[PDB]
Amino acid sequence: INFDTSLPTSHTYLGADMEEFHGRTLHDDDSIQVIPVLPQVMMILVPGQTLPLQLFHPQEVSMVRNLIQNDRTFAVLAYSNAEFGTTAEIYAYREEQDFGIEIVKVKAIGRQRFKVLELRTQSDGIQQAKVQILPEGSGDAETLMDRIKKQLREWDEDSLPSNPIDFSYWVAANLPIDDSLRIQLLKIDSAIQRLRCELDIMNKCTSLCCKQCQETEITTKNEIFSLSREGPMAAYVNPHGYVHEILTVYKACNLNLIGRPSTEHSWFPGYAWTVAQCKICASHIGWKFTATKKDMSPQKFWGLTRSALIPT
Numbered sequence: 001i002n003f004d005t006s007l008p009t010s011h012t013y014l015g016a017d018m019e020e021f022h023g024r025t026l027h028d029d030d031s032i033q034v035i036p037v038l039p040q041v042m043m044i045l046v047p048g049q050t051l052p053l054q055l056f057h058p059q060e061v062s063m064v065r066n067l068i069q070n071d072r073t074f075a076v077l078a079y080s081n082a083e084f085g086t087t088a089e090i091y092a093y094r095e096e097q098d099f100g101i102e103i104v105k106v107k108a109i110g111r112q113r114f115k116v117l118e119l120r121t122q123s124d125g126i127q128q129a130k131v132q133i134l135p136e137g138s139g140d141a142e143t144l145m146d147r148i149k150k151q152l153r154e155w156d157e158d159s160l161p162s163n164p165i166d167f168s169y170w171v172a173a174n175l176p177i178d179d180s181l182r183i184q185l186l187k188i189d190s191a192i193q194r195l196r197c198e199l200d201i202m203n204k205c206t207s208l209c210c211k212q213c214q215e216t217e218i219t220t221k222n223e224i225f226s227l228s229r230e231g232p233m234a235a236y237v238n239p240h241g242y243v244h245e246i247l248t249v250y251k252a253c254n255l256n257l258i259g260r261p262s263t264e265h266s267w268f269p270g271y272a273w274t275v276a277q278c279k280i281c282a283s284h285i286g287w288k289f290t291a292t293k294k295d296m297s298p299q300k301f302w303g304l305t306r307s308a309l310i311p312t
């Protein structure tokens with residue numbers, strides 16, 4: 001590729017002038033902490049994963065302002081339909097105004113996992129969560145990490161973590177799997193146990209389908225390509241604050257193209273998106289990205305929403 005695999009990770013569609021916070025905050029294990037809960041996101045965050053956010057409502061804008069004064073850390077719960085979650089630490093901040101509307105744009109990172117002990121909704125409607133920090137641990141597993149990396153090569157072609165705990169959350173966050181399996185991987189405390197399950201999951205992986213119809217195969221594990229350092233799967237925020245997880249793939253099937261290619265708010269700079277819908281149900285599965293210059297090495301790719309896809 002000729003693209004910069006570090007620009008998808010900068011989220012420059014959010015504005016190119018953000019504050020940076022370098023400090024870190026790691027709570028101790030078994031510790032019990034009260035943290036604000038992100039109000040609209042319904043995702044399963046993995047430690048290491050990056051969360052882009054676009055906040056408009058006064059209640060949400062004031063919260064994030066109190067987080068910057070305090071820990072800059074909040075809670076993202078894993079919903080079975082919320083007994084576990086992950087913490088997210090803001091590392092970049094930017095305040096905007098549009099027609100007298102205060103917009104906040106934040107970039108956050110998954111940090112530590114937790115088990116919800118108690119929940120509270122407050123006067124502003126923003127929920128708060130009393131969580132016990134779950135532990136990670138020690139140990140090594142090089143045989144496993146190498147067998148998992150052998151399989152990932154038979155799928156696509158040191159962009160991969162070298163630490164068992166870090167590698168385990170990279171597969172957790174980048175494998176094409178159901179949210180029921182992401183939770184299972186998040187309920188484990190040892191990395192060795194997680195890398196094992198993750199190797200089974202991918203040996204039993206299948207094509208991905210349209211979730212609305214369960215009748216069209218859109219793509220497979222062997223078409224996944226990484227155009228970003230983060231990985232083949234990355235979260236992005238649309239113009240209305242809706243965060244999507246996107247699988248980047250070279251070929252997608254059973255999709256129709258609606259509209260003319262556009263560059264506005266593109267998550268992949270230099271490219272242009274066109275809505276792709278299922279050929280049978282017409283449900284929005286994602287977008288087809290196309291290059292604005294003939295010199296760009298990946299001239300076309302697909303970005304598919306993990307929300308519109310179900311494993312076969």
Ligand SMILES: N#Cc1ccc(N2CCN(Cc3ccc(COc4cccc5c4CN([C@H]4CCC(=O)NC4=O)C5=O)cc3)CC2)c(F)c1
Nearest residue numbers: 056057098101237238239240264265266267268273287303
């Ligand atoms: N309170 C308050 C408040 C809140 C929000 C305000 N405004 C929001 C809109 N902004 C102007 C605008 C208009 C129209 C468009 C067309 O594009 C759209 C439209 C709808 C959904 C999606 C996309 C693109 N897209 C993906 C495709 C893949 C990719 O690469 N990137 C993406 O984003 C989507 O999912 C873009 C920007 C101006 C600000 C505000 F003015 C006040």
Ligand SMILES: [Zn+2]
Nearest residue numbers: 210213278281
């Ligand atoms: Zn369909």
